[PDB]
PDB file of C-alpha atoms (C1' of nucleotides) in Angstrom:
ATOM      1  CA  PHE P 153      72.595 110.892  33.953  1.00 39.14           C
ATOM      2  CA  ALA P 154      72.521 113.534  30.872  1.00 37.53           C
ATOM      3  CA  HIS P 155      71.835 115.992  33.095  1.00 38.39           C
ATOM      4  CA  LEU P 156      73.400 114.102  36.322  1.00 37.48           C
ATOM      5  CA  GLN P 157      76.988 115.114  36.954  1.00 39.46           C
ATOM      6  CA  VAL P 158      78.977 112.166  38.384  1.00 40.84           C
ATOM      7  CA  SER P 159      82.256 112.769  39.459  1.00 39.90           C
ATOM      8  CA  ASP P 160      85.351 110.584  39.938  1.00 42.51           C
ATOM      9  CA  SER P 161      85.973 108.783  43.149  1.00 44.15           C
ATOM     10  CA  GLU P 162      88.165 110.400  45.479  1.00 42.17           C
ATOM     11  CA  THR P 163      91.431 109.235  47.401  1.00 37.23           C
ATOM     12  CA  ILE P 164      91.041 105.619  48.513  1.00 35.42           C
ATOM     13  CA  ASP P 165      93.592 104.397  50.823  1.00 37.45           C
ATOM     14  CA  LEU P 166      96.878 103.100  50.528  1.00 36.99           C
ATOM     15  CA  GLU P 167      97.345 101.252  54.145  1.00 35.16           C
ATOM     16  CA  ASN P 168      94.001  99.672  53.428  1.00 35.97           C
ATOM     17  CA  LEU P 169      95.351  97.269  50.957  1.00 38.62           C
ATOM     18  CA  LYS P 170      95.127  93.481  51.479  1.00 41.02           C
ATOM     19  CA  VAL P 171      95.276  90.375  48.682  1.00 43.36           C
ATOM     20  CA  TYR P 172      92.213  88.325  48.732  1.00 46.90           C
ATOM     21  CA  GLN P 173      91.374  84.956  47.064  1.00 49.95           C
ATOM     22  CA  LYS P 174      88.054  84.250  45.155  1.00 50.47           C
ATOM     23  CA  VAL P 175      86.509  81.598  45.865  1.00 50.04           C
ATOM     24  CA  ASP P 176      83.631  79.200  44.271  1.00 46.29           C
ATOM     25  CA  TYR P 177      80.049  79.056  46.217  1.00 47.41           C
ATOM     26  CA  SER P 178      78.627  75.810  44.473  1.00 50.30           C
ATOM     27  CA  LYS P 179      78.477  73.453  47.398  1.00 50.15           C
ATOM     28  CA  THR P 180      82.265  73.654  47.708  1.00 50.79           C
ATOM     29  CA  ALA P 181      84.712  76.453  48.859  1.00 47.88           C
ATOM     30  CA  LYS P 182      87.093  75.482  45.862  1.00 46.91           C
ATOM     31  CA  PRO P 183      89.906  78.170  45.279  1.00 47.51           C
ATOM     32  CA  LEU P 184      89.975  79.818  41.542  1.00 48.20           C
ATOM     33  CA  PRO P 185      93.143  80.323  39.803  1.00 51.23           C
ATOM     34  CA  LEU P 186      92.942  84.330  39.355  1.00 52.02           C
ATOM     35  CA  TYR P 187      94.094  86.196  42.608  1.00 53.06           C
ATOM     36  CA  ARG P 188      94.150  89.749  43.355  1.00 53.22           C
ATOM     37  CA  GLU P 189      95.433  92.040  45.615  1.00 50.46           C
ATOM     38  CA  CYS P 190      92.125  94.143  47.229  1.00 46.02           C
ATOM     39  CA  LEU P 191      91.465  96.674  49.608  1.00 45.97           C
ATOM     40  CA  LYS P 192      90.900  95.544  53.306  1.00 43.89           C
ATOM     41  CA  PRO P 193      87.307  96.294  55.314  1.00 46.87           C
ATOM     42  CA  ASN P 194      86.307  98.982  57.641  1.00 44.57           C
ATOM     43  CA  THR P 195      87.842 101.625  55.095  1.00 43.71           C
ATOM     44  CA  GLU P 196      86.179 104.994  54.725  1.00 44.88           C
ATOM     45  CA  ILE P 197      86.180 106.881  50.972  1.00 44.95           C
ATOM     46  CA  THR P 198      84.203 110.484  50.350  1.00 47.01           C
ATOM     47  CA  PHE P 199      82.964 111.912  46.868  1.00 47.83           C
ATOM     48  CA  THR P 200      81.803 115.470  46.005  1.00 50.43           C
ATOM     49  CA  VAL P 201      78.663 114.172  43.982  1.00 46.79           C
ATOM     50  CA  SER P 202      75.892 116.905  43.500  1.00 43.68           C
TER      51      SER P 202
ATOM     52  C1'   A K   1     110.132 177.977 -58.726  1.00 45.64           C
ATOM     53  C1'   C K   2     103.336 174.500 -54.417  1.00 46.88           C
ATOM     54  C1'   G K   3      99.588 181.232 -49.606  1.00 40.92           C
ATOM     55  C1'   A K   4     105.276 180.100 -49.202  1.00 41.88           C
ATOM     56  C1'   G K   5     109.583 178.641 -45.557  1.00 42.08           C
ATOM     57  C1'   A K   6     111.131 177.700 -41.097  1.00 41.02           C
ATOM     58  C1'   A K   7     108.259 176.091 -35.695  1.00 42.64           C
ATOM     59  C1'   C K   8     108.269 169.117 -30.407  1.00 48.50           C
ATOM     60  C1'   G K   9     101.240 171.170 -27.705  1.00 51.09           C
ATOM     61  C1'   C K  10     105.276 171.637 -25.040  1.00 49.65           C
ATOM     62  C1'   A K  11     107.382 173.246 -19.524  1.00 50.72           C
ATOM     63  C1'   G K  12     106.486 172.043 -13.878  1.00 48.47           C
ATOM     64  C1'   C K  13     102.852 168.386 -10.965  1.00 50.19           C
ATOM     65  C1'   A K  14     103.421 161.361  -6.056  1.00 52.44           C
ATOM     66  C1'   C K  15      96.429 158.616  -7.603  1.00 52.65           C
ATOM     67  C1'   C K  16      97.397 160.144  -3.329  1.00 50.09           C
ATOM     68  C1'   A K  17      94.971 161.651   2.167  1.00 46.80           C
ATOM     69  C1'   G K  18      92.336 158.821   6.871  1.00 46.43           C
ATOM     70  C1'   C K  19      90.786 153.664   7.952  1.00 46.67           C
ATOM     71  C1'   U K  20      92.197 147.014  13.380  1.00 44.01           C
ATOM     72  C1'   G K  21      89.989 141.565   8.415  1.00 42.89           C
ATOM     73  C1'   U K  22      87.085 142.980  12.522  1.00 44.96           C
ATOM     74  C1'   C K  23      82.785 141.218  16.107  1.00 46.98           C
ATOM     75  C1'   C K  24      79.844 136.973  18.587  1.00 49.03           C
ATOM     76  C1'   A K  25      80.589 131.418  19.274  1.00 48.27           C
ATOM     77  C1'   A K  26      83.078 125.597  25.289  1.00 49.53           C
ATOM     78  C1'   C K  27      86.254 120.202  19.894  1.00 47.71           C
ATOM     79  C1'   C K  28      81.200 119.656  22.031  1.00 46.13           C
ATOM     80  C1'   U K  29      77.112 115.592  22.177  1.00 45.88           C
ATOM     81  C1'   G K  30      76.304 110.041  23.986  1.00 43.36           C
ATOM     82  C1'   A K  31      78.277 105.723  25.537  1.00 43.28           C
ATOM     83  C1'   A K  32      80.237  99.943  33.789  1.00 41.27           C
ATOM     84  C1'   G K  33      86.266  94.790  32.210  1.00 41.28           C
ATOM     85  C1'   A K  34      81.740  92.287  32.632  1.00 38.49           C
ATOM     86  C1'   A K  35      80.939  87.829  31.891  1.00 41.00           C
ATOM     87  C1'   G K  36      82.190  80.328  33.889  1.00 41.80           C
ATOM     88  C1'   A K  37      88.846  81.971  34.255  1.00 40.12           C
TER      89        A K  37
END
RNA sequence: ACGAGAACGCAGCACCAGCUGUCCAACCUGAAGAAGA
């Protein structure tokens, strides 16, 4: 990494935003208090990482 | 009633002329918002 040059991410789309619920997996799908807006699927982002 | 008396070592004259406090040098190195809210 100290000889690698990782860069930032490029543009992430604005029309691909979709709020989602966080759920539990332990033998039941009980919702959890914290929610968050997220990014909807089938979105493509690009980089320039060499 | 003195080898004496009288007699400015004084007058004119720029410590001055030319000369980059410059040249080289990355404020740089190493470091996830996860996690049982």
